[PDB]
Amino acid sequence: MVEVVSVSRHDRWRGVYVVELEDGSLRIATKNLVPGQRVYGERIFRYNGEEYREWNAYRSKLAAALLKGLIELPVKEGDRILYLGIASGTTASHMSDIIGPRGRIYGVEFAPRVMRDLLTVVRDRRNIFPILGDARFPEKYRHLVEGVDGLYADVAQPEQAAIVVRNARFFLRDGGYMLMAIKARSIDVTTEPSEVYKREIKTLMDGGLEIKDVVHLDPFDRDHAMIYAV
Ligand SMILES: C[S@@+](CC[C@H](N)C(=O)[O-])C[C@H]1O[C@@H](n2cnc3c(N)ncnc32)[C@H](O)[C@@H]1O
User: Fold this and answer.
1) Can you tell me which residues bind S-adenosyl-L-methionine?
2) Which of 18, 85, 114, 139 could form a disulfide with 154 if both were Cys (CB 3.0 to 4.6 A apart)?
C-alpha cells in the first residue's frame, strides 16, 4: 500500500481518480475491480474504505494520452471493447476497472507466450475475454466478438491502420470510438507529419473514421502518439 492524502474522481474522465501523494505530487488511478489483486506491480492505494490501482502513464499508453491532454476518455462503464494487441493486460486491466462487471474487453493477442501471461494476470478478471489470434484476420474470430462500443489498437506493427479498418468493419458500432497507438515523433504531431504517419491517417480516413484528436505521448512514451477517431 502507498499512503495518500486524498483521492477524488476526475471531473471529466469518469472511473479515473486523481490521487495526491505525501509530497503534493499527483497520480491517476482506477478503482480496483478485484480488490486485493495487483496486475503489473502497480502500486495500490486505500481511501474511504476502497482500493485503487495506480494507473502509471509510463507503463500504459492510454493513461499517457489522458495526461497529455486527450480531449475526453471515451472508455465508459459497461462498454464492450475490442482490444487489438492486449499483450499481458496492463492497459486492459484499467479498462476492465472502468467498464465494470457488465462491460467486456475482447483481447486479441497472437503470441502464445504472451497469452499465457495474460491468462495468469487476468484469471480473476472475468470481464476480460482473451482471443488467441492474429488481428490481421478478424474473420477467424468473428464468431467470438460481438458489436463493440470501442476499438483500441496497439499491435506495434507497420500498417496498423489497415488492420484497424478491417476490424472496425466487422465489429465497431455506428459512432464507436477508435483509439490507435501509432509510432510517431513529437514533430509528426506538432510540425508536419512524415510519409508513413500521413498514410496511416489517410487509411483511417479512407476507412470512414474521422480523426477527433491526436496527442503525442512524450515523455511517458517518446516514440508514440495516440490517435482518437469516431
Ligand atoms: C505494444 S504490445 C501492447 C501493449 C498493451 N496494449 C498495453 O498497453 O499494455 C503489442 C502486442 O501485440 C501483439 N501483436 C503484434 N502483432 C499482432 C497481430 N497481428 N495480432 C495480434 N497481436 C499482435 C504482440 O505479441 C504484443 O503483445
Assistant:
1) 90-91, 109-110, 134-135, 154-157
2) 85
Cell 508536419 -> residue: 192
Cβ atoms of 86 and 108 closer than 8 Å: yes
Question: What would the grid cell of residue 222 be?
Answer: 517518446
Using CB distances shorter than 6 Å, the residues near ligand 1 are: 60-61, 85, 87, 90-91, 108-111, 114, 134-136, 154-157
Ligand 1 test: best mutation among 131, 145, 155, most atoms within 8 Å of CB? 155
What is the three-class DSSP state of 177?
strand
Task: Specify the residue for cell string 482473451.
Answer: 130
**CB–CB of 85/135 below 8 Å?**
yes
Partners of 75 in beta bridges: none
Whole-number Cα distances in Å, 149 to 21, 23, 26, 76, 146 = 34, 39, 30, 9, 10
Resolution, Å (one decimal): 1.7
Which among 93, 103, 104 is positioned nearest to 31, based on CA atoms?
93
Q: Are residues 63 and 167 in the same domain?
A: yes
Q: Which domain holds residue 83?
A: 56-230
- Residue closest by Cα to atom 25 of ligand 1: 111
First to last CA, the chain: 38
